[PDB]
Amino acid sequence: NRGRLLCMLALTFMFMVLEVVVSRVTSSLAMLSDSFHMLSDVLALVVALVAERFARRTHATQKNTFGWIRAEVMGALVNAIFLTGLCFAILLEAIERFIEPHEMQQPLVVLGVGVAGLLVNVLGLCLFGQLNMRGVFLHVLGDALGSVIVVVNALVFYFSWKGCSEGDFCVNPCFPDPCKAFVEIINSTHASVYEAGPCWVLYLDPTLCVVMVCILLYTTYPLLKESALILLQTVPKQIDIRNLIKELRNVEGVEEVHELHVWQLAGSRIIATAHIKCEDPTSYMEVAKTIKDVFHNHGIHATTIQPEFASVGSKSSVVPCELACRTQC
Amino acid sequence: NRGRLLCMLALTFMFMVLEVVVSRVTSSLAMLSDSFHMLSDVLALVVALVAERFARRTHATQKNTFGWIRAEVMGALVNAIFLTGLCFAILLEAIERFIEPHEMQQPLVVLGVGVAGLLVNVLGLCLFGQLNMRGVFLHVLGDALGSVIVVVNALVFYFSWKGCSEGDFCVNPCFPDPCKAFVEIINSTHASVYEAGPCWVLYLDPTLCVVMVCILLYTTYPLLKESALILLQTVPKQIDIRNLIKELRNVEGVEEVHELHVWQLAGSRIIATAHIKCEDPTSYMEVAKTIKDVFHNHGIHATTIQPEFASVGSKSSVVPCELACRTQC
Ligand SMILES: [Zn+2]
Ligand SMILES: [Zn+2]
Ligand SMILES: [Zn+2]
Ligand SMILES: [Zn+2]
């Protein structure tokens, strides 16, 4: 449905506006750098929306004689790439939180907007073309787990951390404090009291991002396998070629079955070609009806069985099919 | 060739090792954060390498009755998505250099490694399956233009900027200096001399990244159009369906031409189906030879022309094709 992706696109725009509003109210330019990062969650909805007005034009057009009945199972692919590509990004970025750990300065406000985002994505998840559903549901599960990360982080971050207490002049041993250490080592004045807070919670986030990454990259892969397999002309999973060939040769009136191509258009519109070699060119229609039946019994319905009638003395050359070109094909 | 992508993969690993070596020698943990960003240039070579040992298995296997002759024109797609996706990343990140501009502390060393990277990518470009070539050449042109950015930046950055001079205690008006302003406003001591350098060169980089992004996103798109078009079963650009149908109906012996599917397997292996409606079921082979000729004259060589022989009184129903199923197909 277009209604669902439309509603969810509207919701994410709402939340980005709320985020810019908080980032400007609090006057914290370090938080306005997520209202530009949700433009990566609006893209996976715009794409699966564009591929909704294209799986309905299922009519033979001079520019595609099957129609765009496939632009569904391509949309999913693009999504399941973007996400996975994007997913590695998180992983890469998680490494930076092990080398130069930053500090979540204002934890009440981050808990606030994180719980708002977690609720809007719980709705975007409870809201949910059979592979666009999957290619977008995974993409909202991603940011939902990201929001659970943000809450469980900024939850035990006001509960535990201590940070610099006496104004702006204290020693932060847990990481290479840029101004505190600079001014404190360039001026030795025996200043006021200090403190030191736990560090077992300074790296309680990148571990959560690594877990979210290993969750998405396993929930996504089977979707990506199925999409690329459909798009590589591969026999579906439910049709065994050797059985089709044994059954075509069992039929009366035929003796050989040349090029036998089977594939999958989209969903369950499976096609099938075959040359064939009848013997008597007058009882052909009964043979073709029988062959269409032995295709219909195997979930394969749109066929094309060209019969190659044998001439005089030419039953010694398969490559010509009795009907061929010259060399290339 | 596998040799070219192998050589280039070896070169990029060499350069990443050189980058970690400099980042550890100089003791500048702000530069080790590019030896993790070149793991995004090794991916587009690993993919177009995996799709090299898969466009050579062009043999009918029970798991694909065309073979993987298409896994070339899919590889390109994945590349031309990754890059474009990745390209938006740059653009997004360029915006951060307009809001909170950072400082290239050590410009001689950055010029050094930037010129080394620019030379290794000039080689990776001069080094260069007809769409993998394009899907990887664009991907090296990307980082080559990135390197030109790094050189022209860190070139007129030692030539112009001034920065803080008298030890570690000066005023930096051009941007919200974190330690200088903090310690200078928390302690009013009438300290030593200061200075102020130009700001027309502090934002001489993100403009270069925006130009590199608008260069890649126009050099990539036509590749992505062609790849997705091949993968959506679309008639090629060189075969006009109306002409094929007019020419099949002009041929003797036939009167109607049912489902006429034409598409593109990969490169130039174009297939074509067609039912057809002959009249006299004894002169069929001549008609089929003529039809194969009027397909061969149009760059379309792998055909399948099923003839539907008319029964008694049934020349009033196209939907049955004289040969059909029941309702669904
Ligand atoms: Zn999102
Ligand atoms: Zn993170
Ligand atoms: Zn690169
Ligand atoms: Zn940049």
Residue numbers in the entry:
A (entry chain B), B (entry chain A): 7 to 134, 241 to 441
Q: What does the report in the manuscript say about this coordinate set?
A:
The overall structure shows that the SLC30A1 homodimer is relatively compact, with the TM helices in each subunit forming symmetrical helical bundles and TM2, TM3, and TM6 contributing to the formation of the dimer interface. Under basal conditions, we found that each protomer in the SLC30A1 dimer contains four putative zinc‐binding sites (Z1 through Z4) located in the TMD and CTD. Moreover, a zinc ion in Z3 stabilizes the CTD‐CTD interaction via His408 and His413 in one protomer and Cys437 in the other protomer. Finally, the Z4 site resides in a highly negatively charged cavity comprised of His370, His387, Glu420, and Cys433. We also found that Cys291 in the helical domain in the ECD of each protomer forms a disulfide bond, which stabilizes the dimer conformation and is essential for SLC30A1 function. We, therefore, propose a model for the zinc transport pathway for SLC30A1 based on electrostatic potential and zinc‐binding sites; this model of zinc efflux reflects a novel dimer‐dependent mode of zinc transport that may be unique to SLC30A1 and has not been reported previously for any other cation diffusion facilitators.
The SLC39A protein family contains 14 members (SLC39A1 through SLC39A14) that transport zinc ions from the extracellular space and organelles into the cytoplasm, while the SLC30A protein family contains ten members (SLC30A1 through SLC30A10) that transport zinc ions from the cytoplasm into the organelles and the extracellular space. The mammalian SLC30A1 gene was cloned in 1995 and subsequently found to be expressed ubiquitously in the plasma membrane.
